[PDB]
DNA sequence: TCGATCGATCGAT
DNA sequence: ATCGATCGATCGATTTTTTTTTTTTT
């Protein structure tokens, strides 16, 4: 038989990796060591290592794959048996990788079978789990039915003659759903590649399959690097017919690199609370004790920008923490909060935020007037695909525990916006007309992008008439910090000499003091702290608010207060410290008063 | 890869390049015989010579592409649809639908059922097929309000991200626009500037680079020259290689080859003039309901600058380009002195 | 559809024309078939079928189509000798003019130019670009003009014609469609009225209330031989080389004292641009023309023939060949007047340009005036387009606009 | 018209 | 002379889809 050569080859492959595999070290047993407890039946292998040590089994492996394929499960079994008290439960999942050649849909013919070639595309119209009792037990009905046979075949067939007796061969025994083989997969389609964009023809569709451990770690909207194990697939085909039949095309693949959709959260190789959550103690110790850290942080993300220096100290607000405290079932207590921007025409209103989406993860930005009023709700459908009314999504709600800001905050219809009138505080939204008593939840902050009425700031009218909209909304936005335009040559020449160091291709920016990665990781470490309040400011904020409204004794009240204590508990999160202090108070009070007197005429 | 040239063609290519006449020769040689308003095609060559690549493999910041968009707008008598159907027979990545040709959804996400798979599929768009290319557009002011807030996304972010009950998508698409808008009348009304005539906002009108105004030649005198020459054109039914030597296809590689081996760069040149004159250039505070100069112009200006420095193949920036760039701008930036 | 019962519906029958008579019929031939009726056994399921009900069919051998076939139409018009006796027998043009729908008087200048629509005949491949020679004009204003009369008449006399109205057919009724095929079952595409009326004229009436998206459907024929559909939406390519006989009505009112074109009419002005001749028919009170037509049309009813003893209007049948003979000339163009055709375009574009806000005057006029003088010379059959040849076309377009001065 | 049913039949044993 | 395998006469079992008229929401 063919594959005995592959048996001996992977035998001595085992026998080598039985010893070291790499410099007295092993990279293909410790996966098996983690496997050894649950026995999940996967161990992926590099194909490059086949090119390292086994000396070109590619042309041994890469053409007659399918017939060699099952022998490698027995290879895997002969591996796992060598050291563990072993039953034949062992099985073969594979997630092949490290293969150089990466081709497309078009280089496909009848000569391309039993290979491992690599392909990409996009994910569409995906389909669910769909189990399979692939196996069981089946023979005659007298006594001798214990059949561990090959009945897992694609075309499935009850009929088996016998093992022990001479008996019927058309009367089956019944089936086994108890002590048998079952497995799991799913099924999708994939469209023509966007990395391979030809003209003319359609997006030719491919059928495509995944195994169990491959399942449900793909998703819509992703580009891939798969296996190439095209297969024989078990009207209008009016060719000649024989027998001692008209097939279509199909395909499967057993390896995934679902890249371009991966961040990984937070895990200086040192000791810490967790593995790598803040292993950079060596520097984060300094990043939590410096006294000018506030300004050094302020100027650490806007070197390519120059304007006011007041939201370069505030907007860290939005990315910064809230509370996350331990309370009873009174109600939701909230952590993050609004911000607003208005400004004259294009003082870089948009480049603040066009980048911020690229800055932190989970927080994708766009506008909703890019589409219908399906920003809040999903696309309202009234034709039959499954049950004639399917609205369970949107675009605003695609930012859960992250932000999704807007541009052109003013010209948007008062449906999404009147829904925003509630959706930001009692952060639970509902609808009718297609809702299975619709109960959603958004959670997150916002950033505004208003534009005045006439496109100028002529102080002839109150702010609430400088915009002349509906009112109550302009309180829950707890800070505005408007950018002003003037006419002074010094500023604009400073801007042009920013462009002096945007394209002078060597050293086309200014020096810095703090790099970004350390900043972001310090930020994502600063949340998990369980802050504390035991401070006389906590006792003595009553007079601070009373003084605030002594100034307001000449809109009003305690929404702003809620903000206040959260702005300042955030600015103490910035001190990498629990145990609230009475100075973050005074800064927050100053920010409050800047906002209100900025609102003042 | 399938169009890499031999070095012998570089002779004729750079031979064309070596003369200042090249700025005018190709501008003259686009059309078959149309010999009026050649003042504009000399700017259209800046899109035919399809812009610069200040690549962003550096820091990941700001995605400031050499984003070029320029449009024409005037009467329907001018050969905008005709010229641009010919431009379809020039540009490689030629697309041609138009205002009320297909909606936003008529341009993106042709999502529907297919009997081939016999299953429902997340599916195609139109713009994204023309990445880096062109789509000639006509009769712009007939499109639905749902559309034309789509183009805001591309023109001002140069991106696209899509999310329906099926997939959520973050594709890639970017290109330069051409279009041939028309008003709600036959003629642009005098004493009624484009600031309000066509159907767009108070400052997004001017938000394109510069709309090169077009209108019928309001002059009977010109009619005879074309009515004679361009009917004799038919009457003889072949062409002649006069002083503006039309190269049959050797002209086309000077377009082809000049996207790849070039990287315009600035030494000291195209910054300092407006950096000097910014006081009187930025006294723009005056005006009752007007639109005028803003500090975005120099982005577009550096774009046009390194564009015209690409022609002549000046790897370092051209200084002459600034002059005809200023010409290009102030050719149509006080059409409303009023 | 002439002998159907009074309160019934048209029926049909099937053919199996065997032997050596395949390709002995076309869609639109009032044929006369002679064969043998026979029964038919559609063998199959013994319950629905096998009921002894006899789903019959036909058999035949001989197809002598007595209407619009090889027999009644000769040349299966170019046969010169048989027509020469009448050819030199008469020499006039207006005699062929008012012989078209000769049951009223009035609207003389419309009929002759319409007759230009039937002939055309300007075909070439100059510079690879093909020029369409099918005139497409409309009719505007209908407080009683007999708009549907010229259409219904000329659609009869004009070989291979059609007729539809606003809500008489959907978009697929105008364009292609699909149906199972008794020959093969291929599920092929079958087209609508405009799909088949090519090489001729498809007539439409009451254009405005046709449909909203239909205007693009007619915008597409102005780039001739181009019927692009989205039925399957793959290519939907098709070669329609039809003319168009447009005709629609004004909205509430007829050129209100303040209203203008595109104000009183609510049609796509871009669509209004793509015509060669615009035609509006407005009749204000004429205190002595009404009695003229009253005696004109009342004699349509006491008898069955209008023109008495003033001229010999021609038979339709001789008309059919007399129009076909003019087509085959394809003359040249006179350069000796090319110097002045441009001057004619000068006065054309100027005497309409002397005012600021008169209706549009287009640059395609010089591409249009050339296309009519050729077909007009086709009925000369001479290749002798003269200086007075376009002298009628100049007043033709001259009056085509400025129809409200008085 | 297709399929298994059942009963009969022809060499082995 | 007993019994299993193969042939062949005998039995019963399958054959319904493309427009329209109200309805909710943009
Ligand atoms: N202080 C500044 N720092 C950096 N860029 C600035 C500054 N002030 C103005 N700008 C410029 O102003 C432009 C604003 O454009 P933008 O507001 O994004 O357009 P839109 O209003 O269409 O969103 C930016 O591209 C930027 O180059
Ligand atoms: N300067 C010109 N050169 C060439 N053709 C012209 C010129 N001015 C007007 N035309 C005419 O304009 C027509 C093309 O106009 P087109 O672009 O199709 O109009 P629209 O774009 O409004 O549909 C041609 O038939 C041509 O005769
Ligand atoms: N002078 C006339 N001579 C002959 N028939 C006329 C005359 N004036 C009016 N009619 C009649 O007026 C009718 C006009 O109908 P028509 O205008 O075609 O309807 P629509 O306005 O819907 O097109 C004709 O059918 C014709 O019988």
């Amino acid at each position: 038989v063919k594959d005995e050569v592959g048996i001996r080859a992977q035998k001595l492959f085992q026998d080598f990796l039985e010893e070291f595999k790499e410099d007295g070290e092993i990279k293909y047993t410790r996966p098996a060591a983690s496997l050894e407890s649950p026995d999940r039946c996967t161990l992926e292998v590099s194909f490059e290592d086949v090119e390292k040590y086994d000396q070109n089994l590619a042309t041994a492996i890469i053409e007659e794959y399918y017939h060699i394929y099952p022998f490698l499960c027995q290879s895997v079994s002969n591996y796992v048996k060598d050291r563990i008290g072993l039953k034949t439960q062992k099985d073969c999942y594979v997630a092949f990788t490290e293969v150089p050649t990466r081709h497309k849909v078009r280089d496909l013919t009848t000569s391309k079978i039993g290979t491992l070639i690599r392909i990409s595309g996009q994910v569409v119209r995906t389909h669910p789990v769909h189990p399979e009792l692939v196996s069981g037990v089946f023979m005659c009905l007298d006594c001798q039915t214990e059949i561990r046979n090959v009945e897992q075949q694609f075309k499935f067939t009850n009929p088996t003659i016998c093992r022990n007796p001479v008996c019927s061969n058309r009367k089956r025994f019944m089936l086994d759903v108890e002590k048998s083989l079952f497995l799991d997969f799913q099924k999708i389609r994939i469209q023509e590649t966007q990395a391979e964009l030809p003209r003319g023809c359609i997006p030719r569709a491919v059928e495509i399959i995944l195994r169990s451990e491959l399942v449900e770690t793909v998703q819509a909207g992703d580009r891939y690097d798969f296996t190439g194990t095209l297969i024989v697939v078990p009207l209008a085909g009016v060719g000649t017919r024989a027998e001692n039949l008209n097939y279509r095309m199909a395909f499967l693949a057993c390896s995934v690199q679902a890249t371009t959709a991966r961040f990984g959260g937070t895990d200086t190789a040192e000791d810490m609370k967790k593995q790598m959550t803040d292993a950079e103690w060596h520097k984060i110790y300094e990043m939590s004790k410096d006294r000018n850290l506030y300004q050094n942080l302020i100027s650490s993300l806007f070197p390519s920008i120059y304007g006011n220096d007041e939201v370069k100290r505030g907007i860290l607000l939005q990315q910064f923490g809230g509370v996350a405290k331990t309370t009873t079932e009174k109600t939701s207590l909230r952590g993050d909060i609004n911000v607003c921007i208005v400004g004259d025409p294009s003082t870089a209103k948009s480049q603040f935020l066009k980048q911020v989406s690229d800055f932190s993860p989970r927080a994708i930005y766009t506008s909703g007037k890019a589409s219908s009023a399906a920003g809040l709700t999903a696309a309202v459908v009234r034709d039959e695909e499954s049950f004639d009314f399917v609205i369970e999504a949107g675009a605003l709600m695609l930012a859960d525990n992250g932000i999704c800001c807007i541009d052109e905050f003013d010209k948007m219809d008062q449906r999404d916006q009147v829904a925003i009138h509630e959706a930001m505080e009692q952060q639970t939204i509902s609808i009718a007309r297609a809702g299975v008593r619709a109960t959603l939840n958004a959670r997150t902050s916002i950033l505004a992008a208003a534009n005045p009425i006439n496109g100028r700031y002529d102080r002839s009218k109150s702010l609430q008439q400088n915009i002349q909209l509906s009112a109550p909304i302009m309180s829950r936005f707890d800070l505005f910090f408007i950018l002003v335009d003037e006419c002074n040559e010094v500023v604009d020449y400073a801007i042009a000499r920013k462009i002096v160091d945007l394209h002078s291709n060597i050293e086309e920016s200014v020096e810095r003091a703090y790099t970004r990665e350390e900043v972001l990781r310090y930020v994502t470490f600063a949340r998990q702290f369980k802050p504390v309040i035991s401070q006389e400011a906590g006792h003595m904020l009553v007079e601070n608010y009373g003084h605030l409204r002594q100034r307001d004794t000449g809109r009003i009240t305690v929404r702003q207060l809620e903000s206040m204590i959260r702005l300042s508990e955030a600015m103490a999160k910035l001190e990498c410290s629990n145990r609230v202090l009475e100075r973050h108070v005074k800064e927050a009070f100053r920010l409050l008063n800047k906002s209100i007197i900025r609102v003042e005429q | 890869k399938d169009h890499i040239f031999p070095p012998e063609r570089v002779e004729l290519l750079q031979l064309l390049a070596k003369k200042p006449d090249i700025y005018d020769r190709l501008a003259r040689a686009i059309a078959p015989s149309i010999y009026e308003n050649d003042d504009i095609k000399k700017g259209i060559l800046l899109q035919l010579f399809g812009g610069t690549k200040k690549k962003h493999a550096t820091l990941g910041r700001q995605n400031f592409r050499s984003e070029i968009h320029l449009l024409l707008c005037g009467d329907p008598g001018t050969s905008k649809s005709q010229m641009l159907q010919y431009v379809f027979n020039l540009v490689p990545r030629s697309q041609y639908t138009s205002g009320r040709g297909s909606s936003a959804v008529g341009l993106t996400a042709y999502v529907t059922k297919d009997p081939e798979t016999r299953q429902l599929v997340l599916q195609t768009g139109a713009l994204v097929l023309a990445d880096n290319g062109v789509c000639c557009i006509d009769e712009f002011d007939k499109m639905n309000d749902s559309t034309r807030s789509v183009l805001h996304e591309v023109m001002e972010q140069q991106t696209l991200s899509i999310a329906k009950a099926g997939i959520i998508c973050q594709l890639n698409a970017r290109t330069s626009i051409l279009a041939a808008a028309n008003p709600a009348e036959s003629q642009w009304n005098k004493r009624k500037n484009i600031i309000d005539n066509v159907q767009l906002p108070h400052t997004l009108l001017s938000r394109f680079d510069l709309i090169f105004l077009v209108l019928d030649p309001q002059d009977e005198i010109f009619d005879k020259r074309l009515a004679s020459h361009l009917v004799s054109l038919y009457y003889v039914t072949r062409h002649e290689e006069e002083d503006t030597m039309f190269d049959m296809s050797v002209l086309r590689d000077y377009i082809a080859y000049a996207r790849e081996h070039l990287s315009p760069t600035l030494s000291d040149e195209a910054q300092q003039r407006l950096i000097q004159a910014y006081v009187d250039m930025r006294k723009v505070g005056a005006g009752r309901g007007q639109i005028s100069a803003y500090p975005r112009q120099l982005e577009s200006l550096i774009r046009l600058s390194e564009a015209h420095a690409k022609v002549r193949l000046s790897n370092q920036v051209e200084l002459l380009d600034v002059e005809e760039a200023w010409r290009l701008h102030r050719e149509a930036l006080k059409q409303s002195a009023t | 559809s002439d002998q159907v019962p009074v309160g019934h519906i048209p029926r049909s029958m099937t053919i199996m024309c065997r032997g050596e008579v395949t390709r002995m019929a076309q869609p639109g031939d009032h044929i006369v078939v002679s064969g043998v009726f026979l029964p038919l056994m559609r063998t199959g399921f013994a319950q629905m079928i096998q009921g002894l009900l006899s789903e019959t069919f036909l058999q035949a051998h001989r197809i002598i189509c007595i209407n619009k076939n090889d027999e009644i139409s000769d040349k299966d018009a170019e046969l010169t000798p048989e027509e020469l006796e009448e050819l030199a027998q008469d020499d006039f043009y207006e005699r062929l003019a008012t012989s078209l729908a000769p049951e009223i008087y009035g609207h003389l200048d419309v009929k002759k130019a319409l007759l230009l629509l039937l002939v055309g005949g300007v075909d070439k491949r100059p510079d690879g670009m093909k020029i369409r020679g099918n005139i497409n004009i409309c009719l505007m204003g209908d407080p009683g003009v007999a708009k549907s009369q010229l259409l219904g008449y000329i659609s009869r006399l004009a070989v291979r014609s059609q007729y539809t109205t606003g809500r008489g057919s959907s978009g697929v009724g105008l364009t292609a469609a699909v149906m199972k095929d008794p020959l093969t079952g291929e599920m092929t595409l079958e087209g609508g009225a405009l799909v088949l009326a090519d090489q001729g004229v498809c007539c439409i009436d009451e254009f405005d209330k046709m449909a909203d998206q239909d205007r693009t459907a007619i915008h597409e024929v102005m780039e001739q031989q181009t019927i692009s559909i989205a039925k399957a939406g793959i290519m939907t390519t098709l070669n329609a080389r039809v003319s168009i006989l447009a005709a629609a009505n004004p909205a509430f009112g007829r050129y209100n004292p303040r209203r203008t074109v595109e104000q009183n009419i609510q049609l796509p002005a871009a669509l209004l641009s793509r015509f060669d001749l615009l035609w509006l028919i407005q009749d204000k009170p004429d205190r002595d023309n009404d009695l003229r037509l009253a005696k004109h049309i009342t004699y349509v009813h006491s008898h069955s023939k209008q023109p008495p003893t003033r001229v010999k209007a021609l038979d339709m049948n001789l008309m059919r060949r007399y129009i076909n003979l003019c087509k085959r000339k394809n003359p040249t163009i006179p350069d000796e007047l090319t110097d002045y055709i441009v001057g004619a375009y000068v006065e054309l574009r100027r005497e309409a340009r002397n005012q600021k806000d008169m209706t549009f005057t287009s640059a395609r006029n010089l591409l249009g005036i050339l296309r009519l003088s050729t077909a007009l010379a086709r009925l000369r059959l001479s290749d002798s387009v003269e200086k007075d040849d376009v002298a009628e076309a100049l007043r033709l377009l001259e009056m085509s606009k400025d129809s409200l001065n008085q």
Side-chain angles (χ1 to χ4, degrees), chain B residues 34 36 75-82 139 182 230, chain C residues 363-364 367:
Chain B
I34 287 70
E36 313 296 354
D75 304 326
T78 166
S79 159
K80 302 186 332 308
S81 295
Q82 155 59 75
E139 318 311 327
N182 295 256
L230 316 187
Chain C
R364 287 170 211 197
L367 181 48

Side-chain angles (χ1 to χ4, degrees), chain A residues 304-308 345-351 407 451 495 498-499, chain B residues 64 152 156 207 295-296 298-299:
Chain A
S304 298
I305 301 89
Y306 168 54
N308 68 292
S346 298
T347 190
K349 272 216 277 48
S350 308
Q351 186 64 60
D407 295 327
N451 276 253
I495 290 178
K498 195 73 93 177
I499 289 76
Chain B
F64 291 181
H152 215 269
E156 179 271 342
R207 162 170 261 155
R296 161 165 51 177
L298 51 78
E299 183 66 28

Side-chain angles (χ1 to χ4, degrees), chain B residues 115-135:
Chain B
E116 210 69 5
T117 63
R118 199 46 219 189
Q119 276 90 227
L120 307 159
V121 304
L122 286 303
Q123 212 65 1
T124 68
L127 276 168
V128 186
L129 293 160
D131 196 320
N132 308 276
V134 191
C135 168

